Design an enzyme around this catalytic site. Structure first.
Site: not given
Ligand SMILES: c1ccc2[nH]c(-c3n[nH]c4ccccc34)nc2c1
Length: 265
Positions: A14-16, A18-20, A22, A37, A122
């Site tokens: 979902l996203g990489e 800084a700490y690891g 998700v 996460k 932040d």
């Molecule tokens: C599209 C792209 C990236 C996303 N990151 C989330 C997301 N939901 N809950 C979180 C909790 C922490 C970090 C990311 C998320 N939903 C997405 C949909």
């Protein structure tokens, strides 16, 4: 009673962070989605702590934590809308009414956090997640901390956040109030929603564009993109003296804040 109800398929990154990383996980029985996460402690007790305190429709819900030796898993609300960051078209922004709605939800969530004595520290479009209806949720309490306990404020002194969003007292002063820092960062995010651009690299007297704002030269970008109602609100939020800066109850009375703009979903 239900067997494999506790198995989740890790489905995609979902996203990489800084700490690891998700990862979007999905429940094999119920098809429920969650972001998990992943923090490998060896490369957070506070982030888990602050998360357990939180319950509000504009804050990302935290469900629980699996400990797994070193790997810390945090089990958080999935927001299929992704990040606000992505609904801001560069150099343009988004429609005034979309913005004003996301700003009402951001205020709501921030009122919710200050009122329980937490500061997020932040705030920025990357940390503002959007669910399927496009409801804003504040995400990531990694940098956050307590600023009222047993009803006595503590001043902050640790420098943190993200330079273009950060209040100027936190670069000039040894100690400062938590709540005007978040307010300030709310106004940077507003400015972004309305101009598609950030005003300065940092709120330093050594920053030309910051001196321009302080000089009031609003015939320059990003302010020329903006429009006298919202900008008037922004003249109250981006005030250099944190004691003179508008507070949240006062942003709730502001004229553009209360301007009818949008036909409901
Ligand atoms: C599209 C792209 C990236 C996303 N990151 C989330 C997301 N939901 N809950 C979180 C909790 C922490 C970090 C990311 C998320 N939903 C997405 C949909």
């Amino acid at each position: 009673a239900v067997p494999f109800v506790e198995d989740w398929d890790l489905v995609q990154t979902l996203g990489e962070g800084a700490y690891g990383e998700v990862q979007l996980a999905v429940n094999r029985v119920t098809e429920e989605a969650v972001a998990v996460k992943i923090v490998d402690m060896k490369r957070i007790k506070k982030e888990i702590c602050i998360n357990k305190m939180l319950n509000h429709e504009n804050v990302v819900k935290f469900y629980g934590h699996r400990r797994e030796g070193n790997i810390q898993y945090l089990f958080l609300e999935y927001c299929s809308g992704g990040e606000l960051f992505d609904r801001i078209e560069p150099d343009i922004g988004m429609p005034e009414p979309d913005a004003q709605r996301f700003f009402h939800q951001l205020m709501a969530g921030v009122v919710y956090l200050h009122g329980i004595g937490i500061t997020h520290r932040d705030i920025k479009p990357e940390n503002l997640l959007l669910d399927e209806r496009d409801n804003l949720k504040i995400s990531d309490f990694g940098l956050a901390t307590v600023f009222r306990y047993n009803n006595r404020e503590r001043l902050l002194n640790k420098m943190c956040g993200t330079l273009p969003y950060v209040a100027p007292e936190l670069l000039k002063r040894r100690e400062f109030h938590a709540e005007p820092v978040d307010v300030w960062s709310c106004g940077i995010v507003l400015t972004a929603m309305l101009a598609g651009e950030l005003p300065w690299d940092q709120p330093s007297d050594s920053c030309q564009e910051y001196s321009d704002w302080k000089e009031k030269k609003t015939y320059l970008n990003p302010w020329k993109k903006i429009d006298s109602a919202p900008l008037a609100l922004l003249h109250k939020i981006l005030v250099e003296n944190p004691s003179a800066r508008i507070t949240i109850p006062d942003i709730k009375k502001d004229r553009w804040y209360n301007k009818p703009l949008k036909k409901g979903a």
